[PDB]
């Protein structure tokens, strides 16, 4: 497949890439177990070997040069780094990181694992939200994805958490749902909010200002259906809330429903 010169160049590059991944995932040298497992390849990055010298070492066999084993180990580290990065703002406990590293290492084949698929879905959401402009769909997606990242950081991807699975399903469905289907987006978000066990799903997860924008969006969708000016003023008062709550959404729903009955 690869010529000897290119094979050993690949070995050197993979050692360097593993070193970079370790530096990015654990700059503070807190993941002692992982760094111990990767000691044989991180030794060549600790010392300032030049590319030529490390390539000579790889050719001589002194440094790890089984490109398949290096690929497996590099992937084990890279999937963990992707997991840590996809929840960047929400840090993950060292114990959780080490346990998930062990789970990934134990896995037979990462590139077909459920962890890899879950990371791919979370990365779909994160990438979309990295550039999408503020709209009802995008605000709903950002809220749900931030909650999903918090749940991932607090539990991890190496299990069958029903909450994380539900958030993945709903986030992907909303993402695939057309931009113009305002009603479907709003009802999907409303269903998610109503099905979250907590009364305030987004409290503390999103900033207070983004909370205000989310409640403002819900009020914007609620307002045009109202007819009574008194209930409209009640809705305006509710719009002053700084946090989204399940009971607040229920109150808005009841307001629009009495307006419907009065019609």
């Amino acid at each position: 497949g690869l010529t000897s010169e290119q094979y050993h160049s690949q070995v050197v590059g993979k050692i360097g890439y593993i070193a970079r991944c370790m530096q990015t995932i654990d700059p503070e040298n807190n993941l002692k177990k992982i760094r111990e497992d990767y000691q044989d390849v991180l030794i060549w990055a600790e010392k300032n070997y030049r590319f030529e010298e490390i390539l000579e070492a790889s050719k001589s066999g002194k440094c790890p040069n089984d490109l398949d084993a290096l690929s497996r180990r590099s992937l084990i580290l890279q999937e963990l780094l992707r997991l840590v990065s996809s929840i960047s703002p929400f840090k993950m406990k060292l114990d959780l990181i080490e346990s998930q590293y062990e789970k990934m290492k134990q896995h037979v084949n990462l590139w077909k694992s459920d962890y890899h698929v879950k990371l791919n879905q979370l990365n779909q959401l994160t990438d979309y939200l990295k550039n999408a402009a503020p709209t009802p769909k995008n605000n709903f997606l950002r809220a749900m994805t931030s909650v999903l990242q918090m749940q991932i950081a607090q539990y991890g991807i190496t299990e069958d958490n029903e909450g994380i699975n539900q958030l993945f399903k709903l986030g992907l469905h909303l993402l695939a749902m057309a931009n113009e289907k305002i009603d479907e987006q709003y009802h999907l978000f409303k269903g998610y909010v109503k099905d979250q066990p907590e009364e305030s799903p987004f409290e503390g997860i999103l900033p207070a200002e983004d909370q205000k924008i989310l409640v403002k969006t819900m009020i914007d969708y609620a307002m045009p259906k109202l007819s009574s000016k008194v209930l409209q003023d009640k809705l305006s008062a509710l719009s002053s809330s700084d946090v989204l709550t399940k009971t607040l959404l229920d109150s808005i729903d009841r307001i629009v429903k009495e307006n419907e009955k009065l019609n």
Partner: protein
């Protein structure tokens, strides 16, 4: 640096003072800089097969010596571009020249050097970090759809001495610099790769994932795999456009490369007119498939070398976008025209005519081209996995699959989707004949089906056997008529008709079954085969009774169930979500079970 033209006869230009020239190297002959390929060397006298018309080239004309063979120019700007077989940007030539022709000896850069690209370097890379060929050292936001990952060329390596900060850079700007053994290499955002050289990969893994198209006949009966090789007949009413559109719009391929490789003028005009207008829904927004598609388009009056290298340019661009981690789908519109160009080049070189006039290496060339398809563990540090699926179509003379090109293609490829004009006339769309078609990837996809679609494999086997039995019984119907058929034979015929007309037949224009998700396809086939099996069971287990059941009895009792089976198509995957469609099919199955239990 410069040679001189010593003689000219037809496209063959003999150039003197070319001592250092290399075999099969590219040169610019004449004052208009006609492209030419060095096909011989003798002392300083290099013989050049000039691609363009050599009229007007005079002795003494300078011959600039490009230091590369025919090499495609890879980098940002490929996506949405229309290229000649030589990498000439037709869409840029027409804009810059404001003319309907391609000027003789045009030298427009394949990728615009003036357009600015947003380049974000890899965050981990620094000064001194070790980097190796295939490593992604930056990403360019080419589109809202395709993120172009800038990678080191293969055969390159070293230690980074300068990595540009994130910002706006053009293909001429130096974005990275590395050093190896003291030699310093400055890499811009554009590399170059010889088209006839296979781009290296760390490993070529087996193909183990379907290349979904949305067409039920293709996805279910004759599945292709990401990294597969397929052949398609090319005829007037066959309907290859359905395959091309399905692969361009609905397939899971991250990238599409469509190679004209020498189509008729208006035939290629149709493709250039249609492909830009096609659209795909991604993230709920209707983007243009040209955000993720490239067109190596060239008609039959283009230089024969352009047509012959069209396949190689297409497959090299596809390999480039595979190495980035994407799943590319290359489609050669008619490999027969490429083979004709190859035969023409052979004749021009006066090489010995092999079988029926084709060169002595047609089989080798086709095999080596199709060998570039496959799923690979992409070269480079970031662990990736790409694939290139070649769906190259072929044109059998008058429907005969025995000519050298069709024979070699069918021997090499592993799938054959066998479009038929006969079914097109019968208004059976897609026109896959589902009897001459075949797929050799079923044993490779057994694992995937058993993981995700456990029941699909027996359903497909039963459907294929049903269709074969119907084909065999078509003759018995002629010999003795329908009245002489057994009840089991009547069931077979009347479920084979059901599958033909309500499962294989699919209208690409309707909003409900333009794209048929595989879960929907397997659900429909499950319901059809369940109806078949329970009807067969009833007929067999009532053969012993005086009140024997007949297909007529079953039809009379369950016209409603048969109507629902015919109407399973009409479920909209978008509005009727996966959950709703699955629940409705399960309810349908419950109703068939209730009706059969009552009848039996």
């Amino acid at each position: 640096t410069f040679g001189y033209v010593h003689g000219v006869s037809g496209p063959v230009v003999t150039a003197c003072d070319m001592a250092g020239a290399a075999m099969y190297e590219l040169v610019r002959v004449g004052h208009s800089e006609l492209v030419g390929e060095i096909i011989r060397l003798e002392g300083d006298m290099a013989t050049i097969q000039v691609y363009e018309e050599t009229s007007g080239v005079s002795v003494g004309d300078p011959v600039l010596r490009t230091g590369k063979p025919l090499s495609v120019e890879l980098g940002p700007g490929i996506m949405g571009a229309i290229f000649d077989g030589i990498q000439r940007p037709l869409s840029d030539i027409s804009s810059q020249t404001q003319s309907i022709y391609i000027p003789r000896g045009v030298n427009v850069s394949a990728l615009s050097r003036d357009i600015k690209w947003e380049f974000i370097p890899s965050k981990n890379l620094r000064v001194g970090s070790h980097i190796t060929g295939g490593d992604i050292y930056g990403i360019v936001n080419e589109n809202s759809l395709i993120k172009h990952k800038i990678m080191l060329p293969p055969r390159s390596r070293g230690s980074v001495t300068y990595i540009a900060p994130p910002g706006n850079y053009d293909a001429s700007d130096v974005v990275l610099e590395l050093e190896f053994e003291g030699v310093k290499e400055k890499l811009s955002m554009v590399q170059v790769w010889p088209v006839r050289q296979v781009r290296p990969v760390t490993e070529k893994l087996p193909a183990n994932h379907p290349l979904l198209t949305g067409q039920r006949v293709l996805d279910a009966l004759f599945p292709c795999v990401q990294g597969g090789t397929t052949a398609i007949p090319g005829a007037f009413g066959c309907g290859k456009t359905v395959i091309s559109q399905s692969l361009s719009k609905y397939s899971n391929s991250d990238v599409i490369i469509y190679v004209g490789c020498g189509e008729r003028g208006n035939e290629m005009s149709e493709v250039l007119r249609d492909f830009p207008e096609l659209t795909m829904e991604v993230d709920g927004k209707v983007e243009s498939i040209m955000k993720r598609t490239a067109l190596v388009a060239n008609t039959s009056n283009m230089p024969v070398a352009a047509r012959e290298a069209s396949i190689y340019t297409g497959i090299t661009l596809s390999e480039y976008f595979r190495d980035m981690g994407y799943h590319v789908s290359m489609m050669a519109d008619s490999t027969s025209r490429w083979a004709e160009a190859l035969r023409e080049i052979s004749g021009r070189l006066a090489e010995m005519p092999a079988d029926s006039g084709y060169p002595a290496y047609l089989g080798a060339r086709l095999a080596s081209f199709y060998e570039r398809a496959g799923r690979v563990k992409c070269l480079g540090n970031p662990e990736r996995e790409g694939s290139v699926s070649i769906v190259g179509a072929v044109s059998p003379p008058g429907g005969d699959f025995s000519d050298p090109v069709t024979s070699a293609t069918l021997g090499i490829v592993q799938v054959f989707w066998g479009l038929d004009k006969k079914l097109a006339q019968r208004k059976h769309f897609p026109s896959v004949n589902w009897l001459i078609s075949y797929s050799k990837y079923m044993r490779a996809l057994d694992e995937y089906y058993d993981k995700h679609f456990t029941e699909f494999v027996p359903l497909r086997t039963k459907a294929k056997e049903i269709l074969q039995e119907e084909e065999d019984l078509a003759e018995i119907v002629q010999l003795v008529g329908k009245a002489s058929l057994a009840e089991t034979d009547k069931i077979t015929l009347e479920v084979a008709k059901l599958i033909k007309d309500d499962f294989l037949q699919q209208n690409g224009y309707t909003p409900y079954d333009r794209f048929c998700p595989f879960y929907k396809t397997v659900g429909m086939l499950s319901n059809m085969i369940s109806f078949y099996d329970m009807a067969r069971r009833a007929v067999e287990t009532t053969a012993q009774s005086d009140n024997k059941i007949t297909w007529s009895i079953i039809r009379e009792h369950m016209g409603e169930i048969l109507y629902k089976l015919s109407s399973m198509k009409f479920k909209d995957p978008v509005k009727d979500g996966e959950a709703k469609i699955k629940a409705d099919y399960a309810q349908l199955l419950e109703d068939m079970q209730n009706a059969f239990r009552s009848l039996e």
